[PDB]
Amino acid sequence: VRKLATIRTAGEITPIAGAEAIECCHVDGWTCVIKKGEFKQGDRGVYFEIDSFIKEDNDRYPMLSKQVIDYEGQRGTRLRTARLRGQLSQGLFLPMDRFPELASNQVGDDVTEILGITKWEPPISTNLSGEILGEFPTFISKTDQERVQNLIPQIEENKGQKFEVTVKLDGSSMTVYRKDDHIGVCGRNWELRETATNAQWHAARRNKMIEGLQFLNRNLALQGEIIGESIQGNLEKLKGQDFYLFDIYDIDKAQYLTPIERQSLVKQLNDNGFTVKHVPILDDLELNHTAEQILAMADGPSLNKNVKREGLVFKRLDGKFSFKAISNAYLEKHKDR
């Protein structure tokens, strides 16, 4: 679960053309507007990522008093991508002289819950309670990916290694899995139960991925995104709904398949009449890039090429280091994204 509020170190500090009452401060892979003289490079502070919802507080967060909104009946501020005075800024960075409670906390610490911060998210309508069958399975890994802006040391340790590049689609997360007899279909947090009307099960039925799971006679979790019409506002403008696979979890080994295993097993699935789609795969990447060059690849064509993608996901070919890179152009365009 994401670390929305963390203690980080100030990176390079550069002037902002237009106003000299503010400056640009690099925070790991992010760039955020700070007031001039609030930080100099090497200082510590609390960094709040975008998507953070920060309750109203004119003592601690007066800087936010002109973006206060209603979220779930609570007054507060939602941090987003924005362009203040021409400068792209992401997140909020406040010095530690401002948090006496965290004096003794250190760099890398998660202070999300101590500061009472929650994640703002758009109003997805979950599926209702007659439809849930149980938790999301504990024997299956969840779909979440760390952002490349938070992984600057790992980009340098993984230099020279190679990575599968896939177009990130924005839809609902969906898992279809087999464990012994049980074949279940899960949303993002709940295992749902068999229905014709249901959109997740409808996707499992027309792709025939359940019969493919019994054909392979293995306890595997197929994890992918479901997109199309009536879906996530349908950025991709696709007719109908469909599942696009991006990961396969080996339940027995509690570990993800390599990109090549996943690629050949989808082929094996398709070589036997089970038509399961994959998120668009791009050319593999030999890593020798910086966080801004990876973000620079993030923008580009989506599945629908007259729509530009949410971003990229990178998976090392041993299958145990992966990260995402969201196009900031996309985030500038969409207001609740």
130 in the same domain as 240: yes
178 in the same domain as 63: no
Whole-number Å distance between alpha carbons of 4 and 246 = 25
Q: Minimal CA–CA distance to 159: which of 288, 284, 318, 283? A: 288
With 0-12 / 13-18 / 19 or more C-beta atoms within 10 angstroms meaning exposed / middle / buried, residue 148 is: buried
* Three-class SS state of 229: coil
Tokens for 305, please give them: 């090429």
Cβ neighbours for 232, distance < 8 A, ≥ 6 positions apart: 170, 171, 172
The technique by which this structure was obtained is X-ray
The residue to which tokens 């906390």 are assigned:
105
| Feature table: binding site | 2, 51, 119, 121, 143-145, 147, 166-170, 173, 188, 225, 315, 324
Residue 169 CB: number of other CB atoms within 10 A?
Answer: 23
275 in the same domain as 193: yes
The answer to whether the CB of 271 falls within 8 A of the CB of 263 is no
Q: Which helix (H) or strand (E) holds 231?
A: none
| Feature table: binding site for ATP | 2, 119, 143, 145, 147, 166-169, 188, 225, 315, 324
Whole-number Å distance between alpha carbons of 135 and 123 = 21
The answer to whether the CB of 304 falls within 8 A of the CB of 238 is yes
Tokens for 195, please give them: 């229905």
Q: Minimal CA–CA distance to 248: which of 165, 176, 324? A: 176
Whole-number Å distance between alpha carbons of 194 and 201 = 7
* Three-class SS state of 53: strand
Angle at 162 between CA 159 and CA 166, to 5 degrees: 120
Whole-number Å distance between alpha carbons of 296 and 149 = 12
Q: Minimal CA–CA distance to 327: which of 33, 90, 85, 68? A: 90
By residue count, the chain amounts to 337
Whole-number Å distance between alpha carbons of 312 and 303 = 12
Residue 4 CB: number of other CB atoms within 10 A?
Answer: 24
> Can you name the residues that pair with 172 across neighbouring β-strands?
226
Cβ neighbours for 315, distance < 8 A, ≥ 6 positions apart: 163, 164, 166, 259, 321, 322
| Feature table: binding site for AMP | 143, 166-169, 173, 225, 315, 324
CA 328 → CA 80, 82, 113, 312, distances in Å? 11, 10, 27, 12
294 in the same domain as 254: no
Angle at 311 between CA 325 and CA 137, to 5 degrees: 80
* Three-class SS state of 111: coil
Whole-number Å distance between alpha carbons of 15 and 242 = 47
Reduced to 3 DSSP states, what percent helix, strand and coil does the chain have, rounded to the nearest 5? 20, 35, 45
Handedness of CA 200, 206, 261, 293 (dihedral sign): negative
Backbone phi and psi for residue 254, each to the nearest 5 degrees, phi listed first: 55, 45
The answer to whether the CB of 175 falls within 8 A of the CB of 169 is no
DSSP string for 280-333: PB---EE----HHHHHHHHSSB-SSTTSB-SEEEEEETTSS-EEEEE-HHHHHH
Cβ neighbours for 88, distance < 8 A, ≥ 6 positions apart: 31, 81, 82, 328, 332
* Structural domain that includes position 153: 144-170+280-337
86 in the same domain as 164: no
Dihedral Cα 104, 107, 111, 112, nearest 10 deg? 170
Angle at 32 between CA 112 and CA 19, to 5 degrees: 140
CA 74 → CA 22, 77, 259, distances in Å? 30, 10, 43
324 in the same domain as 227: no
127 in the same domain as 103: no
The answer to whether the CB of 5 falls within 8 A of the CB of 52 is yes
Whole-number Å distance between alpha carbons of 9 and 153 = 13
| Feature table: binding site for Mn(2+) | 51, 121, 144, 170, 225
65 in the same domain as 23: yes
Q: How many domains does the chain have?
A: 3
269 in the same domain as 187: yes
What is residue 257's DSSP assignment? P
The answer to whether the CB of 52 falls within 8 A of the CB of 40 is no
Residue type, 275: T
What is residue 12's DSSP assignment? E
Last residue of a domain, one of 248, 263, 279: 279
> Can you name the residues that pair with 30 across neighbouring β-strands?
27
